[PDB]
């Protein structure tokens, strides 16, 4: 019904009281594997959940995705007041309580919830993000997966402040509906860290210099809320 990503205009986005402080628990979370999907890097996880906020119940974390561009100042999927970040990380959660599978979740409008964490290149070597960079050797080829071989805690990638926007959109490939949670505050990384992501390959062959998607028009019946 409404395609993702979009541009979130702060002037137009309203402030709703139902958007309470978000309960984020990635204490149980641990990465199982890392993948080169042909489009992007994707880390799969076991454990952890999100809750509270505007959610009717907790949604269990499923996967992590990473998006980037050919230029350091233009790589996010989502924009905020027509501003684009260096890259975007998506965290896909699903309704384990209601539905008996992730594939059943995709089929429904209340099935998926996707957090967005922005990456901004700021001349700061992120100690935590480097642990993902160290795995990129094992998935250089297109459509290859290796087990994630490192101690890694996901809640070290959360921003400083956790105020957020939210809207009914879709998954990036438009395969299913998904309620987005967009954190305006980004996390800091170095250019050399993102540089290694461009040395991955894809479906003739060519390096993945960029994998983001261009924004869409906000529908008449789609409003963006704010914490």
């Amino acid at each position: 019904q409404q395609l993702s990503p979009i541009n979130i205009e702060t002037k137009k986005a309203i402030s709703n009281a139902r958007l309470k402080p978000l309960d984020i628990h990635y204490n149980e979370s641990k990465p199982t594997t890392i993948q080169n999907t042909g489009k992007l890097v994707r880390i799969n996880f076991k454990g952890g959940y999100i809750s509270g906020g505007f959610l009717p119940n907790e949604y269990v974390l499923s996967s992590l995705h990473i998006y980037w561009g050919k230029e350091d100042d233009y790589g996010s999927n989502h924009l905020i007041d027509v501003y684009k970040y260096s890259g975007e990380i998506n965290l896909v959660h699903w309704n384990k309580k209601k539905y008996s599978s992730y594939e059943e979740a995709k089929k429904h409008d209340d099935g998926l919830i996707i957090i967005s964490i922005f990456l901004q290149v700021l001349d700061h070597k992120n100690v935590y993000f480097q642990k993902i960079v160290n795995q990129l050797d094992s998935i250089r080829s297109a459509n290859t997966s290796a087990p994630f071989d490192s101690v890694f805690y996901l809640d070290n990638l959360l921003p400083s402040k956790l105020d957020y926007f939210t809207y009914l959109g879709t998954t990036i490939n438009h395969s299913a509906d998904a309620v987005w949670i967009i954190f305006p505050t980004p996390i800091n990384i170095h250019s050399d860290q993102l540089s290694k992501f461009r040395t991955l390959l894809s479906l003739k062959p060519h390096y993945i210099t960029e994998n983001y998607r261009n924004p869409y028009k906000l529908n008449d019946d789609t409003e963006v809320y704010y914490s």
Epitope: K30, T32, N36, E103, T144, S145, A146, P147
Partner: antibody, heavy 124, light 108 residues
Framework: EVQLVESGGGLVQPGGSLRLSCVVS????????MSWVRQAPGKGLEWVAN????????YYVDSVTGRFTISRDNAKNSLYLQMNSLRAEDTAVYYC?????????????????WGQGTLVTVSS | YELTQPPSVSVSPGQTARITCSGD??????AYWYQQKPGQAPVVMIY???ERPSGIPERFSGSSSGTTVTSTISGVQAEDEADYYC???????????FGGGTQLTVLG
């Protein structure tokens, strides 16, 4: 739909050699790690070995290492298993299957089916 | 590295069965559960701990806590009399393993 038509071997002399094969259809074989599982008559399931999509990583049991070897051809869309120096304890039904959905690109639930298997009897 | 499950479990029709596996890498790695009937290949009942395939009855459900993973069959039917094996990788993620296998015998 998914089908894992496990062709391959049969009777072979002890210490001999064989090459099983597993043709696949219904899902992107290229994206999955693939694995061989065996099951002796009236016995449990034993994982034999697995292989990475490109074939740059292969892992076996902490026995059977120096004589078994996996291969695969993604164009012909099939999994293979050379096995030399065969024993009586290698007498089993050999199953071709994807086990791990975390080690697979665009993972689907449908691709966890198992085939019928090929009986490998080792006897003098 | 091996996955430990009880070789035998006995239940009566209409009762809630529970078959549990143990392993050091279960905090890291997901498990799978395969039903096997006489003269037939293994078939998945539950995957990734708690995800049921289409076709499998709602009776079958899976839960996880720490180093244990527990397949659960509610209102068990005689249909369900079969061996159930749990499947997982070691903590490196390279060496795949099956459990000993649990013979689920239905009484009465």
């Amino acid at each position: 739909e998914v089908q894992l038509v496990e062709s391959g071997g049969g009777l072979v002399q002890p210490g001999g050699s064989l090459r099983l094969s597993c043709v696949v259809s219904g899902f992107t074989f290229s994206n999955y790690w693939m694995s061989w599982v065996r099951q002796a008559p009236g016995k449990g399931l034993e994982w034999v070995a697995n292989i990475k999509q490109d074939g740059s990583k292969k892992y076996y049991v902490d026995s059977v290492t120096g004589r078994f070897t996996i291969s695969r051809d993604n164009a012909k869309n099939s999994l293979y298993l050379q096995m030399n120096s065969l024993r009586a304890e290698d007498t089993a039904v050999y199953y071709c299957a994807t086990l791990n959905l975390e080690l697979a690109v665009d993972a689907i639930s449908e691709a966890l089916k198992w085939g019928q298997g090929t009986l490998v009897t080792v006897s003098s | 590295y091996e996955l430990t499950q009880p070789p035998s479990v006995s239940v009566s029709p209409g009762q809630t069965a529970r078959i549990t596996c143990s392993g050091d890498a279960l905090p890291k790695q997901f498990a799978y559960w395969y039903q096997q009937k006489p003269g037939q290949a293994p078939v998945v009942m539950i995957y990734k701990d708690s995800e049921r395939p289409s076709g499998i009855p709602e009776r079958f459900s899976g839960s996880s806590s720490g180093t244990t993973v527990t397949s659960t069959i509610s209102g068990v039917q005689a249909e369900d009399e079969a061996d159930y094996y749990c499947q997982s990788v070691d903590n490196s993620g390279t060496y795949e393993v099956f459990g000993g296998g649990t013979q689920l015998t239905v009484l009465g």
